[PDB]
């Protein structure tokens, strides 16, 4: 009863490879193409919101989620696989950083954590790895804005800009074409709009598309007043409008 | 009642009557002499028609309420409304167990349709008893003779009220810890009816 | 190896066949059902199928009242049905107990959503072959429809149906909603919403229903609930009046 | 095939059957024969003590779990020893806890579901011994039989292990005789002696091979071996 | 593929546990046994297969009680049910302990199936070889359920498990139509004995004994007790005449 | 169906009670309830036809129209039952004509089953189709 599977559910191929992992990237690469761009002024990530039904209210799910007010990320993979991670991801941050450090981690460590997680999901018995990889937008003071891609392998690494999921390649291609060090976010946004529209086969609009940025600290979102030090979240999700707005900025 | 949590005091009393049961208590919550909250609502819903008078530590009772209520809720979410008794059963455990951690006397009063109102005492002893009516809390002392004499069964809705109100006021008068205002709550076939009575009323009875 | 289908592990494609097969178990009960957010309300209708006399037919529901506010319809086997509601039952009071206010519907969904993803990821854990749709009229979100899958995947719905013939009513309402253009059925009497539904259930199912034919429930503000056969009959009568 | 369906006690046959049980069931008849019977007065065990060699000793098939309660075995002794010990606790336990003798009835109840757990629980296996159990109590002398299937029964008499049928048939044939032999353990016994002779095949019962036990009204569970079996031989 | 059959918790490509289905194999393999929701109460009846003279009649009694108001009977592994019986016998007192009240049959029900459903949830957790007719008078009237190793039970105005069910299924369905009114437990007592013999006729080949019990809000006064003695003999004679 | 016959037969007089003197419901309520959409004893379509004809002969073929208009709406005994009466009705509307042709003309698309398709009884609903057409012609 219980679990009698304690043994690593992925094993070294005769080639040493880990098939399930290598199978995960499949479903990972399967993911609805999601992009991210670390700009000068900030970071923006984007992906199309895939509705399985108009009855289904697309907005009611979010393929991007803030982790810390300056950090949010997107995935390509199973929405569920995306689901629980953030909870931990958010949770661990408070616990394993904030509740220690009274503040929100440098994205790197926050990144570092979930990477470790999936490795467990990789190596642990009775478990499989997750079906998502993670484009991670974050800004911390000393490390500034940060753009991180993480796999079910937990393999993680920075980007200047990037995309994952289904059509990521030609996007990244177009991105690499498009990208410069100096990309302004709206540019990058527009760029992503360009970029994502490419990977967007279905309806392309704000309601169909998910854009979030790491912007400036957002005192409008401070939700209180009278604390100078706290200037709000840097992370921001753009509106369908702001998209549809910037979709006219196309 | 650990040091630093607030002291309810007053006197909690509930009377099953001709239409059901009514709960009553004072609103006064004292810290030593200092009434912390004079307006406190000490009568409490574990269940729509099943209710409780809380004495002992609020922090005890206050939590205790959430507990049983949570269960009854879930229980109801499963098996529907438990009996008013069935709720106290839940309490009885807690009391009869955590009693050594627990300061709660509780009148469990609830209206069943079938059985009309149901008074259930749970002193801190973890013992449980159904009564025609119950009184507890500080001034309950002074008024035992009063209530006992001046109680009757199937008293009308109001007969319950002021006799209780007198009972309470006496306690409130007599007790220092009993006061604020009289909150009464009627549990009948009709339903839950919360009542309030201001000192300028019940002080004079 | 080929166990990849027997168990939850990424297929060579990164696919989970038990999941995909749990999906089979979903309509394996072959009950078609719907969830429609009325204007005020949310209403859920389903096929009450009474194959036997020896049944106590009354006992038969896949629509389950989760909370005060929240009910849910199950699409899937009654053991697995009876399970998740139980599972759901806890979280509510739990949430409420913990959080002092009742659980919002989707929270349960998101909650219950988490659950299979576990079993999805938890090999020995099998996911459940029930499809679940939670509904309430949320103090925040008002009328609400949240359907979840054996995969822990879930979303909000302007409305939904579910069952073998789901697509049909799906089209129907999609037709009617693309028609009606508003997320909810706009009716103040859930009755109408029901009557609307039973129509559009009768409509897309092309299927007239007796009052014993229908599992019928209504999520209303602060109270999810269902109907007796008579409100159903009332509808059957009421719906027989529009037509 | 079966190696598919047999290997796991957790795994039904396509017919919904547990071959391990059936296997354990096999070790049953594999076990040495032994016999038991009851009157309403007394309940008698009659066992065939098998040895390894003559140099070896003779495996005893009979167990005393209690004054009012003792049993006999066929199939795997180690299981029963536990169970017996386990059981021994119970009468003890009861008479410990309640000062109450375990009902031979209530006894049989125990091991059943106890065995049932061996069954339904993967990673494990059933016990390898079915049991004949004589007991006397407030309800009188009771001979009960257990199956590693978990299944238990009170019989007026019975036998198990190898070819118990011969006795069994004869016993089932003998039925009303011994059950009416009352306050006469001896003929209750000698019935079994005859019974076991029925399912005696290879050789005759001996001082060493014949084992005998009886519990009865005022007969506590009492085992007879050797010279104790000598006179009944 | 295959092997879906082998491991319990596995969903076969059809989304099915064949073990459970194989459990059902053992289930129907059970001795025919029936139960009857009657007017005040429910009635439980099962053939007791007599395999030999040495069988001490009336001793081995398949129907077991939970609390005193819950009678139960099952076709399948006798250890399974008993195992679950105590498992049930737990919950009531358990429930009754917490809730001070003996448990409602329906309350009492869902407990079991979930527990049973567990026996689905793992490939090793071999479900129970039993389906079980059970119920009784509870806070409101009788109830009668019969639970599948699946974890499926429902409300059953009558129920039958074992081989001879179909002999009974009609017979019950008959009395359903014979008595959509209801039935005195004693007539259910009478009817069942027939039905069982009739159910027995599927198994007719060998001698058998007949265990019948019941929960009559009237007679047991909201309790479960066994059909016994003369009314038992009555129902028998009743039946044993009507079998002719 | 004894009562289905009997209560009809009971309504028979009960109709003829207020028929000779409505009792339109006497006849009706019986099968109205009993068969309704959900058969109790069901009845003969006659028991419903009985109604209709006791309606018909007695009532306005005007009202009977509107009557059957509604009777159609609940159930009948079947998509068939009434509409046979409804068919002979058309002869009787033509046992009426002018406005009772126009009443027939009413009956036309009241429910198709006279000129057109709800029932399959085109062997009739085609008739009134042309039959009114024959008038529509005129």
From Swiss-Prot, chain A:
Matching Gene3D superfamilies: Glutamine Phosphoribosylpyrophosphate, subunit 1, domain 1
Cross-link entry Glycyl lysine isopeptide (Lys-Gly) (interchain with G-Cter in ubiquitin), positions: 108
Localization annotation: Cytoplasm; Nucleus
Principal location listed in the UniProt entry: cytoplasm
Record keywords: Cytoplasm, Isopeptide bond, Nucleus, Proteasome, Ubl conjugation
Other comment: Present with 7060 molecules/cell in log phase SD medium.
Role noted for this protein: The proteasome degrades poly-ubiquitinated proteins in the cytoplasm and in the nucleus. It is essential for the regulated turnover of proteins and for the removal of misfolded proteins. The proteasome is a multicatalytic proteinase complex that is characterized by its ability to cleave peptides with Arg, Phe, Tyr, Leu, and Glu adjacent to the leaving group at neutral or slightly basic pH. It has an ATP-dependent proteolytic activity.
Family: Belongs to the peptidase T1A family.
Description of how the protein assembles with itself and partners: The 26S proteasome consists of a 20S proteasome core and two 19S regulatory subunits. The 20S proteasome core is composed of 28 subunits that are arranged in four stacked rings, resulting in a barrel-shaped structure. The two end rings are each formed by seven alpha subunits, and the two central rings are each formed by seven beta subunits. The catalytic chamber with the active sites is on the inside of the barrel.
Name this protein carries in UniProt: Proteasome subunit alpha type-2
Native organism: Saccharomyces cerevisiae (strain ATCC 204508 / S288c)
Classification of source organism: Eukaryota, Fungi, Dikarya, Ascomycota, Saccharomycotina
Curated annotation (Swiss-Prot), chain C:
UniProt superkingdom: Eukaryota
Cross-link Glycyl lysine isopeptide (Lys-Gly) (interchain with G-Cter in ubiquitin) per UniProt, renumbered positions: 223
Keywords: Acetylation, Cytoplasm, Isopeptide bond, Nucleus, Phosphoprotein, Proteasome, Ubl conjugation
Localisation: Cytoplasm; Nucleus
Gene Ontology cellular component list: mitochondrion; nucleus; proteasome complex; proteasome core complex, alpha-subunit complex
Sites bearing Phosphoserine, chain numbering: 228
Gene Ontology biological process terms from the UniProt entry: proteasomal ubiquitin-independent protein catabolic process; proteasome-mediated ubiquitin-dependent protein catabolic process
One Pfam assignment: Proteasome_A_N
Annotated PANTHER family: PROTEASOME SUBUNIT ALPHA/BETA
Additional notes on this entry: Present with 15200 molecules/cell in log phase SD medium.
Assembly, per entry: The 26S proteasome consists of a 20S proteasome core and two 19S regulatory subunits. The 20S proteasome core is composed of 28 subunits that are arranged in four stacked rings, resulting in a barrel-shaped structure. The two end rings are each formed by seven alpha subunits, and the two central rings are each formed by seven beta subunits. The catalytic chamber with the active sites is on the inside of the barrel. Interacts with CIC1.
Protein name, UniProt field: Proteasome subunit alpha type-1
Species, as recorded: Saccharomyces cerevisiae (strain ATCC 204508 / S288c) (Baker's yeast)
Name of the gene: SCL1
From Swiss-Prot, chain E:
GO MF entry, a single one: mRNA binding
Assigned keywords, A-Z: Acetylation, Cytoplasm, Nucleus, Proteasome
Keyword match DNA-binding: no
Cellular localisation: Cytoplasm; Nucleus
GO process terms (BP): proteasomal ubiquitin-independent protein catabolic process; proteasome-mediated ubiquitin-dependent protein catabolic process
Transmembrane segments: none
Predominant cellular place of this UniProt entry's protein: cytoplasm
Post-translational modification: The alpha and beta forms are probably products of the same gene with different post-translational modifications.
Record GO cellular component, one term: nucleus
Job of this protein: The proteasome degrades poly-ubiquitinated proteins in the cytoplasm and in the nucleus. It is essential for the regulated turnover of proteins and for the removal of misfolded proteins. The proteasome is a multicatalytic proteinase complex that is characterized by its ability to cleave peptides with Arg, Phe, Tyr, Leu, and Glu adjacent to the leaving group at neutral or slightly basic pH. It has an ATP-dependent proteolytic activity.
Subunit structure and binding partners: The 26S proteasome consists of a 20S proteasome core and two 19S regulatory subunits. The 20S proteasome core is composed of 28 subunits that are arranged in four stacked rings, resulting in a barrel-shaped structure. The two end rings are each formed by seven alpha subunits, and the two central rings are each formed by seven beta subunits. The catalytic chamber with the active sites is on the inside of the barrel.
Note: Present with 12000 molecules/cell in log phase SD medium.
Swiss-Prot record, chain F:
Post-translational modification: N-acetylated by NAT1.
Range of residues in the leader sequence: none
Family: Belongs to the proteasome subunit p55 family.
Additional facts recorded: Present with 5710 molecules/cell in log phase SD medium.
Protein purpose: Acts as a regulatory subunit of the 26S proteasome which is involved in the ATP-dependent degradation of ubiquitinated proteins.
Protein name: 26S proteasome regulatory subunit RPN5
Upper classification of the organism: Eukaryota, Fungi, Dikarya, Ascomycota, Saccharomycotina
Residues represented out of the complete protein: 9 to 149 of 445
């Amino acid at each position: 009863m219980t679990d009698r599977y304690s043994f690593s559910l992925t094993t070294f191929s005769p080639s040493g490879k880990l098939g399930q992992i290598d199978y995960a990237l499949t479903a990972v690469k399967q993911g609805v193409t999601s992009l991210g761009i670390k700009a000068t002024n900030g970071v923006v990530i984007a992906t199309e919101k895939k509705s399985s039904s108009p009855l289904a209210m697309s907005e009611t799910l979010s393929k991007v989620s803030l982790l810390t007010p300056d950090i949010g990320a997107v995935y390509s993979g199973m929405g569920p696989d995306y689901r629980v991670l953030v909870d931990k991801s958010r949770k661990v941050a408070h616990t394993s950083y904030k509740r220690i450090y009274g503040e929100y981690p440098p994205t790197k460590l926050l990144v570092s954590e979930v990477a470790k997680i999936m490795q467990e999901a990789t190596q642990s018995g009775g478990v499989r790895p997750f079906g998502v990889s993670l484009l991670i937008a974050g800004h911390d003071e000393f490390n500034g804005f940060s753009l991180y891609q993480v796999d079910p392998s937990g393999s993680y690494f920075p980007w200047k800009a990037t995309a994952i999921g289904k059509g990521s390649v030609a996007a990244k291609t177009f991105l690499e074409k498009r990208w410069n060090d100096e990309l302004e976010l709206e540019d990058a946004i527009h760029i992503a709009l360009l970029t994502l529209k490419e990977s967007v086969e279905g309806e392309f609009n704000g309601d169909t598309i998910e854009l979030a940025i790491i912007g400036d600290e957002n005192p409008d979102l401070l939700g209180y007043t009278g604390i100078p030090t706290d200037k709000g979240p840097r992370f921001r999700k753009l509106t369908s409008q702001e998209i549809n707005d910037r979709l006219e900025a196309l | 009642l650990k040091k630093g949590e607030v002291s309810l005091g007053t006197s909690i009393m509930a009377v099953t009557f001709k239409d059901g049961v009514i709960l009553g208590a004072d609103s006064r919550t004292t810290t030593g002499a200092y009434i912390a909250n004079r307006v406190t609502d000490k009568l409490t819903r574990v269940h729509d028609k099943i209710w409780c008078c809380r004495s002992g530590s609020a922090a005890d009772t206050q939590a205790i309420a959430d507990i049983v209520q949570y269960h009854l809720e879930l229980y109801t979410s499963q098996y529907g409304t438990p009996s008013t008794e069935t709720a106290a059963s839940v309490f009885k455990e807690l009391c009869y167990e955590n009693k050594d951690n627990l300061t709660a006397g509780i009148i469990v009063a609830g209206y069943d349709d079938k059985n009309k109102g149901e008074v259930y005492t749970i002193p801190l002893g973890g013992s449980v008893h159904k009564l025609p009516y119950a009184i507890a809390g500080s001034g309950s002392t002074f008024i035992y003779g009063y209530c006992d004499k001046n109680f009757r069964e199937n008293m009308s809705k109001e007969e319950t009220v002021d006799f209780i109100k007198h009972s309470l006021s006496q306690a409130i008068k007599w007790d220092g810890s009993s006061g604020g205002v009289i909150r009464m709550v009627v549990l009948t076939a009709a339903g839950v009816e919360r009542l309030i009575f201001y000192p300028d009323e019940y002080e004079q009875l | 190896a080929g166990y990849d289908r027997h168990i939850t592990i990424f297929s060579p494609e990164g696919r989970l066949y038990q999941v995909e097969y749990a999906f089979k178990a979903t309509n394996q009960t072959n009950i078609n059902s719907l969830a429609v957010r009325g204007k005020d309300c949310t209403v859920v209708i389903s096929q009450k199928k009474v194959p036997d006399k020896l049944l106590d037919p009354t006992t038969v529901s896949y629509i389950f009242c989760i909370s005060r506010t929240i009910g849910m319809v199950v699409n899937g086997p009654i053991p697995d049905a009876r399970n998740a509601a139980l599972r759901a039952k806890a979280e509510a009071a739990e949430f409420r107990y913990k959080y002092g206010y009742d659980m919002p519907c989707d929270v349960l969904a998101k909650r219950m959503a988490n659950l299979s993803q576990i079993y999805t990821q938890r090999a020995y854990m099998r996911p459940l072959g029930v499809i679940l749709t939670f509904v309430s009229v949320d103090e925040e979100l008002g009328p609400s429809i949240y359907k979840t899958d054996p995969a822990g995947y879930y979303v909000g719905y302007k409305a939904t149906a579910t069952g073998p013939k789901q697509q049909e009513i799906t089209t129907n309402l999609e037709n009617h909603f693309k028609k009606s253009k508003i997320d909810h059925i706009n009716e103040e009497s859930w009755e109408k919403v029901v009557e609307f539904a039973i129509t559009h259930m009768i409509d897309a199912l092309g299927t007239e229903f007796s009052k014993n034919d229908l599992e019928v429930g209504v999520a209303t503000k602060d109270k999810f609930f269902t109907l007796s056969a008579e409100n159903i009959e009332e509808r059957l009568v009421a719906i027989a009046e529009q037509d | 095939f079966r190696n598919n369906y047999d290997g796991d006690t957790v795994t039904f046959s396509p017919t919904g059957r547990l071959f391990q049980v059936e296997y354990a069931l096999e070790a049953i008849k594999q076990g040495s024969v032994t016999v038991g019977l009851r009157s309403n007065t007394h309940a008698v065990l009659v066992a065939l003590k098998r040895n390894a060699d003559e140099l070896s000793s003779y495996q005893k098939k009979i167990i005393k779990c209690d004054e009012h309660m003792g049993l006999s075995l066929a199939g795997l002794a180690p299981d029963a020893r536990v169970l017996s010990n386990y059981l021994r606790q119970q009468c003890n336990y009861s008479s410990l806890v309640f000062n109450r003798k375990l009902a031979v009835e209530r006894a049989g109840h125990l091991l059943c579901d106890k065995a049932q757990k061996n069954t339904q629980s993967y990673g494990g296996r059933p016990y390898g011994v079915g049991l004949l159990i004589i007991g006397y109590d407030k309800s009188g002398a009771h001979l009960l039989e257990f199956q590693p299937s978990g299944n238990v029964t009170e019989l007026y008499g019975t036998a198990i292990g190898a070819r118990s049928q011969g006795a069994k048939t004869y016993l089932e044939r003998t039925l009303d005789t011994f059950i009416k032999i009352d306050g006469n353990p001896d003929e209750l016994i000698k019935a079994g002696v005859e019974a076991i002779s029925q399912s005696l095949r290879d050789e005759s019962l001996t001082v060493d091979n014949l084992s005998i036990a009886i519990v009865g009204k005022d007969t506590p569970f009492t085992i007879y071996d050797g010279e104790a079996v000598a006179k009944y031989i | 593929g295959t092997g879906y059959d082998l491991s319990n918790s596995v969903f076969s490509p059809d989304g099915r546990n064949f073990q459970v289905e194989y459990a059902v194999k053992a289930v129907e393999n059970g001795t025919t046994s029936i139960g009857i929701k009657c007017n005040d109460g429910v009635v439980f009846a099962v053939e007791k297969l007599i395999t030999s003279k040495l069988l001490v009649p009336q001793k081995n009694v398949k129907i077991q009680v939970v609390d005193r108001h819950i009678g139960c009977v099952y076709s399948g592994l006798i250890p399974d049910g008993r195992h679950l019986v105590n498992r049930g016998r737990e919950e009531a007192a358990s429930f009754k302990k917490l809730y001070k009240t003996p448990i409602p049959i329906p309350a009492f029900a869902d407990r079991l199936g979930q527990y049973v459903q567990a026996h689905t949830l793992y490939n090793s957790v071999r479900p129970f070889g039993v389906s079980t007719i059970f119920g009784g008078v509870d806070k409101n009237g009788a109830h009668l359920y019969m639970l599948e190793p699946s974890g499926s039970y429902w409300g059953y105005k009558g129920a039958a498990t074992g081989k001879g069910r179909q002999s009974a299924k009609a017979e019950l369905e008959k009395l359903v139509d014979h008595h959509p009114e209801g039935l005195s437990a004693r007539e259910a007592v009478k009817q069942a004995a027939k039905i069982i013999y009739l159910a027995h006729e599927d198994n007719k080949e060998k001698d058998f004994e007949l265990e019948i019990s019941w929960c009559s809000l009237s007679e047991t006064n909201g309790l479960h007790k066994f059909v016994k003695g003369d009314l038992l003999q009555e129902a028998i004679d009743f039946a044993q005449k009507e079998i002719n | 169906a004894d009562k289905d016959y009997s209560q009809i037969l009971k309504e028979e007089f009960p109709k003829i009670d207020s028929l000779a003197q409505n009792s339109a419901l006497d006849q009706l309520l019986v099968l109205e309830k009993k068969t309704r959409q959900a058969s109790d004893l069901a009845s003969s379509k006659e028991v419903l036809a009985k109604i209709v004809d006791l309606l018909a002969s007695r009532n306005k073929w005007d009202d009977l129209n509107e009557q059957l208009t509604l009777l159609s709406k609940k159930h009948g005994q079947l998509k068939l039952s009434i509409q046979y009466m409804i068919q002979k009705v058309m002869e009787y509307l033509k046992s009426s004509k002018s406005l009772d042709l126009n009443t027939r003309i009413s009956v036309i698309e009241t429910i198709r089953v006279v000129t057109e398709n709800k029932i399959f009884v085109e062997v009739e609903r085609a008739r009134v189709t042309k039959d009114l057409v024959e008038i529509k012609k005129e």
